[PDB]
Design a protein around this ligand. Structure first.
Ligand SMILES: [Ca+2]
Ligand SMILES: [Ca+2]
Ligand SMILES: [Ca+2]
Ligand SMILES: [Ca+2]
Ligand SMILES: [Cs+]
Length: 360
């Protein structure tokens, strides 16, 4: 049925991009369909199944955003407040002028993409933040950033008086029922941990690193992510504060050309062209500063949009698309880092094929 539309697109996708295995969740009002394809590990041939864990990379950022938003709903975190209010060890730095909202929208003054090599632990990280000088106007320019969302994770953890991972597990993952979601894959589940393949056909698995948890560290199943997506689409029953936290992550905060930056989530008004989506996932959007105009009539969550987030590691590639107006969402996880253009095309074809959008 749904599988009739889905399966040939995935097969062609996996053949065209030589992806060993995929896990796919389609969320709709009527229920969720989970599909697994191919091998969790090319060398061993172990099949992808209900238990297979995939590195989701920057998809992790949506959880980080969600926890941040929940701290805000509980009144423990103020989004427009200076970051140094919750992290006094940054008092007197640029983070007297940068808010948690800036960090969640990548408008923190040009805070760079990658954690620098000199930063090896928490203490060298906080020293790096104290000394860093903005290179872009705060709140007026977007630079996609691991350091920024990372800091939002640390700001959030302080505001909740807890450690990031257990606090995420207790306040977001457990209540969403996301029990196959891990930051550090336990020894007992290593057999379910899919092996990544890089662009050269080589086995690869993500290494620990500074701010890994906050920015890119999650290993999970497609079904678990579908639960986050379910909740975003108002198709789950969750704690009222959690739902409100989740809803607030889709508030539009900045216009960035054709893209609206919400809280980590990025969105486009419908109808959207695939080329517009592709431009969102390209060099010009991801790897350059883009002018960003604040929406302070803070836009209420919209029901006429394409909401998405890509996430990758060296050996993994993931994509989440939500269409709130159609109560429809799509999660695609692969143990290959294949081009974002191809993720976009496959998503669009799936959703168009399902009748959830129209091509012209
Ligand atoms: Ca405020
Ligand atoms: Ca490095
Ligand atoms: Ca860590
Ligand atoms: Ca094509
Ligand atoms: Cs768990």
């Amino acid at each position: 049925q749904t599988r009739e539309v889905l399966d040939p697109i995935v097969a062609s996708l996996m053949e065209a991009q030589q992806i060993p295995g995929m896990a796919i969740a389609l969320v709709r009002p009527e229920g969720t369909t989970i599909s697994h394809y191919g091998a969790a590990d090319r060398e061993t041939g172990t099949p992808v199944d209900d238990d297979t864990l995939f590195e989701i990379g920057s998809l992790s950022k949506t959880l980080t955003a969600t926890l941040a938003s929940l701290a805000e709903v509980e009144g423990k975190l103020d989004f427009d407040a200076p970051v140094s209010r919750y992290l006094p060890e940054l008092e007197g730095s640029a983070f007297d002028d940068i808010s948690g909202l800036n960090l969640g929208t990548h408008t923190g003054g040009g805070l760079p993409l990658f954690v620098p090599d000199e930063v090896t632990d928490r203490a060298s990280l906080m020293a790096w933040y104290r000394e860093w000088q903005p290179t872009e106007p705060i709140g007026e320019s977007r630079t996609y950033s691991n350091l920024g969302i990372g800091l939002l994770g640390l700001e959030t953890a302080a505001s909740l008086d807890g450690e990031f991972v257990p606090t995420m597990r207790a306040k977001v993952l457990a209540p969403l029922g996301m029990q196959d979601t891990w930051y550090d894959v336990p020894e007992a589940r290593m057999a379910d941990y899919a092996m990544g393949e890089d662009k050269d056909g080589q086995p690869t698995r993500v290494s620990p690193g500074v701010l890994d948890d906050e920015a890119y560290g999650i290993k999970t199943t497609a079904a678990d992510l579908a639960k986050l997506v379910r909740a975003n689409l108002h198709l789950a029953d969750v704690d009222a504060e959690l739902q409100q936290a989740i809803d607030a992550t889709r508030q539009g905060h900045y216009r960035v050309g054709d893209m609206t930056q919400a809280l980590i989530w990025e969105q486009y008004s419908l109808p959207v062209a695939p080329e517009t989506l592709r431009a969102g996932q390209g060099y010009d959007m991801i790897l350059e500063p883009n002018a960003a105009e604040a929406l302070e009539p803070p836009q209420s969550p919209r029901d006429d949009v394409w909401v998405n987030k890509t996430g990758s590691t060296q050996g993994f590639g993931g994509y989440i698309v939500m269409l709130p107006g159609k109560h429809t969402g799509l999660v695609m996880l692969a143990n290959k880092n294949y081009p974002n253009d191809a993720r976009v095309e496959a998503a669009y074809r799936i959703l168009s094929g399902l009748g959830a959008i129209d091509v012209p």
